[PDB]
Amino acid sequence: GKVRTKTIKRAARKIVENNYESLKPKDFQNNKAICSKRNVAIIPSKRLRNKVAGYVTTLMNRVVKGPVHGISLRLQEEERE
RNA sequence: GGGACGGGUGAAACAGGAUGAUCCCGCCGAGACCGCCGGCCGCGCAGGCGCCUGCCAAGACCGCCUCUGUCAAUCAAGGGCGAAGGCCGGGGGCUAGAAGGCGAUCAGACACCACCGUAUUCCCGGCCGUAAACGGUGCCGCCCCGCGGCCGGCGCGCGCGUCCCGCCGGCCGCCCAGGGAAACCGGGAGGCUCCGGGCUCUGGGGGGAGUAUGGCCGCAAGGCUGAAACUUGAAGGCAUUGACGGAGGGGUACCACCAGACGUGGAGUCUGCGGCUCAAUCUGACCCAACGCGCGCACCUCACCAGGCCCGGACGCGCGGAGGACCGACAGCCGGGCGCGCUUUCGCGAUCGCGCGGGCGGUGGUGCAUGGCCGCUCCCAGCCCGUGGCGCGAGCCGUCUGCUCCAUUGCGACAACGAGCGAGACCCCGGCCGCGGGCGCCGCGGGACGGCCCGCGCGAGCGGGAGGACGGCGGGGCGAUAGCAGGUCUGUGAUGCCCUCAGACGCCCUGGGCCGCACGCGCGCUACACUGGCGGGGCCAGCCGGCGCCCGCGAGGACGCGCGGAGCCCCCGCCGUGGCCGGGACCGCGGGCUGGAACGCCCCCGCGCACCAGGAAUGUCUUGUAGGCGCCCGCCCCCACCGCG
Ligand SMILES: CC[C@H]1CN2CCc3cc(OC)c(OC)cc3[C@@H]2C[C@@H]1C[C@H]1NCCc2cc(OC)c(OC)cc21
Ligand SMILES: [Mg+2]
Ligand SMILES: [Mg+2]
Ligand SMILES: [Mg+2]
Ligand SMILES: [Mg+2]
Ligand SMILES: [Mg+2]
Numbered sequence: 226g227k228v229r230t231k232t233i234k235r236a237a238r239k240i241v242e243n244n245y246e247s248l249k250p251k252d253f254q255n256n257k258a259i260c261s262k263r264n265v266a267i268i269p270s271k272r273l274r275n276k277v278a279g280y281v282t283t284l285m286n287r288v289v290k291g292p293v294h295g296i297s298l299r300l301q302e303e304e305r306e
Numbered sequence: 307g308g309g310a311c312g313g314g315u316g317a318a319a320c321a322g323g324a325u326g327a328u329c330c331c332g333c334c335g336a337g338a339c340c341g342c343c344g345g346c347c348g349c350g351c352a353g354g355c356g357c358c359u360g361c362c363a364a365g366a367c368c369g370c371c372u373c374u375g376u377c378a379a380u381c382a383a384g385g386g387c388g389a390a391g392g393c394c395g396g397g398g399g400c401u402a403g404a405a406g407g408c409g410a411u412c413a414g415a416c417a418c419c420a421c422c423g424u425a426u427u428c429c430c431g432g433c434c435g436u437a438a439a440c441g442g443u444g445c446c447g448c449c450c451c452g453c454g455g456c457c458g459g460c461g462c463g464c465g466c467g468u469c470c471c472g473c474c475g476g477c478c479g480c481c482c483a484g485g486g487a488a489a490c491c492g493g494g495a496g497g498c499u500c501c502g503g504g505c506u507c508u509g510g511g512g513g514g515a516g517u518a519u520g521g522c523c524g525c526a527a528g529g530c531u532g533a534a535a536c537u538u539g540a541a542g543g544c545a546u547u548g549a550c551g552g553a554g555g556g557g558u559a560c561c562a563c564c565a566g567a568c569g570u571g572g573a574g575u576c577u578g579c580g581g582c583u584c585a586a587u588c589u590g591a592c593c594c595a596a597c598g599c600g601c602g603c604a605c606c607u608c609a610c611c612a613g614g615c616c617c618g619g620a621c622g623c624g625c626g627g628a629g630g631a632c633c634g635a636c637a638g639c640c641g642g643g644c645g646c647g648c649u650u651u652c653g654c655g656a657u658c659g660c661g662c663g664g665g666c667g668g669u670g671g672u673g674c675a676u677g678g679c680c681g682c683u684c685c686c687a688g689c690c691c692g693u694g695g696c697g698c699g700a701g702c703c704g705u706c707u708g709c710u711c712c713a714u715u716g717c718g719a720c721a722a723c724g725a726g727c728g729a730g731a732c733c734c735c736g737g738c739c740g741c742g743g744g745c746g747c748c749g750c751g752g753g754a755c756g757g758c759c760c761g762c763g764c765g766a767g768c769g770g771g772a773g774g775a776c777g778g779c780g781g782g783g784c785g786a787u788a789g790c791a792g793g794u795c796u797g798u799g800a801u802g803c804c805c806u807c808a809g810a811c812g813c814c815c816u817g818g819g820c821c822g823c824a825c826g827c828g829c830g831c832u833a834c835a836c837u838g839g840c841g842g843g844g845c846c847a848g849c850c851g852g853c854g855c856c857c858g859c860g861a862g863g864a865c866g867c868g869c870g871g872a873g874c875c876c877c878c879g880c881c882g883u884g885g886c887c888g889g890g891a892c893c894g895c896g897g898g899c900u901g902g903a904a905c906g907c908c909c910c911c912g913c914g915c916a917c918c919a920g921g922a923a924u925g926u927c928u929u930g931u932a933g934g935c936g937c938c939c940g941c942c943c944c945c946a947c948c949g950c951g
Contacts, residue, residue, distance in 0.1 A: 227756060227767075227778065228715045230730060234766095253757045272755085273731070279755040291764090 229280050233273075237280045240266050241288065242296050250286035253279060 241248060244265055249255050257278040259265050268274035284296075292298050 226730080228711050228713090229756095229766090230715070232731085234716085251758080253755060257755085270731075271752095275753095275755045275757095276731095277755095279757065282755090282757075287765095293764090 226276075229276065233277055233280050236266070237277055237284055238296060240277075240281055241284055245298070248281065248285050250282050250289055253282055256282050256285070 240260065244259060247259055257275065260268065260274060260278050260281065266277075268277060284293075287293065288296060288298070292300065
């Protein structure tokens, strides 16, 4: 499985926009661990958790290098003028 | 001049060439025709119109404080012009080319393709008078959204450009209203059921039939005009959804191909399927999507054939019955046998007997009356809902002519917005690691996620390299909407309606048959040998699993207890290319097992069929895979060339 279904992407986007300060991209361990938290998000199945975490890391580094539309980063401070 | 082919086709073959072709070059003759410029340019009443030079007459448009004064529009009759082909009489003869000839293609080809070639194509004079002669839209006249291009003429403005602002006329494109059955028109096909500007022509369901008979015209071919009888229930127009296409564009798959591998069809044989035979050889299914499939047929299984027992007829109503309803039997004959039948005479006692209503039962029929279960479409990626919008409407958008994915899987848009099903996720199995427990290795968890690096791409995602037990859908299960006259009434206390119901299609018993064989083929098995056959020896599997002693050559047999695994292969020798020690079909004595009963199955001696690698055709397959080798379960009294593993 390489193409990721819609559910993965939508939930991953929600997670990033919600928990951004504690998702360091480029690692598959931190993000998996954080997604394990129920205060963060709940995954019924192991494989789904790994899949979601992987997409979350790829989205997070894509964003840290160049933020995207549809994901809110509160960057006004450096673009509010 | 030079020296061997040239022509033509998808590929070829007829015609041409040492009598020098094809090719190069120069000259000569004749007759057609008028290119690239050439056009949402133009002219003309239409048909139609393209070399240079000269001559002749003509025409529309524009400009005008020119002239006349209703002189106009449309039109049967009548007159004139009129593509191409065709005809008459004269000229001319190069290309092409009806007819004709010939070579190919084809089952045929007198057609499409190739080659030769008459009339014709050209000019003069004259007939004919037809075309999808189409803008499939008659002529005159009025009003009418907006934008724009080109042609001709004239005027205004300036910074004088072949500038831009206008007017008339012409040729075009898009288009709001409006119109329409709609396609579409909008310089009208508008101003019209709110249905009257003027003139002429045509039509009244489809065929018969533009035919017959008359008339006029013409050399002719033919043109103009133009019925009836009879027959028929639809024929047609515009548009929607599907299916199909020897239509185009994107994709995809060893049930498709490339590259290979292993095979089948050639023999012998197991089995099933048609045909023949019999008393019966019981039946279902016939391209994918019937033919080792409806889970192993001596009796049952079993319907089919030859024969025979029994009522095992509930429950109600009417009549009879213990002064005796119904039921069994020793002995002798006929009967495969039975108190089956008969011949004498004993026994039993209401568990009922006859009729009428009313049952149960039945591998009997319709799978085209049905339920249920499968097969196929489908080893697919597709299917729909609420609100909203477009159309009179069936319907359309949502649900994608962009880029990606094996995938309506995703990125990014858009009169659509928002959800759902299928796909994924999901469950079983195996590879690595940990904990716990442990008669027997079996319970709970981690781990792999396109995660890291480098290239690209906004994007999702593609290519390469690592590290790791494993790297990119590892093998299976589940399986959308809608549908089929697919199979099944012979799987069932699943069933409607038919047929059978006391000489039974009920149930049971003895036999036979389903295996019978001039022949056609479907899935398989054994071989055609030296990469081998025989003998002796050594040795390791998993689904899982039972052994000792003694007789017997072996298959097997009598005892007694709980204990236990192979072929290929490797080593040593013989055989030595001979249908031979390859091959083991077929057949004759014999010894055993199961079973009430061998037609069934094993072992021993003997005989030793075809087969020398298999035509036209055709099937399957990408890693622990094909192929080769063997081992257990299923149905099973005995037996596996079958099927699941
Ligand atoms: C009109 C002549 C026909 C003669 N043949 C028959 C055999 C044949 C075999 C071919 O396979 C190689 C072939 O490929 C081009 C052509 C032929 C010709 C076919 C001719 C039939 C003709 N009409 C049908 C379709 C067709 C297609 C063609 O392909 C272009 C073609 O080539 C000239 C001719 C034809
Ligand atoms: Mg002519
Ligand atoms: Mg007309
Ligand atoms: Mg009217
Ligand atoms: Mg009418
Ligand atoms: Mg009519």
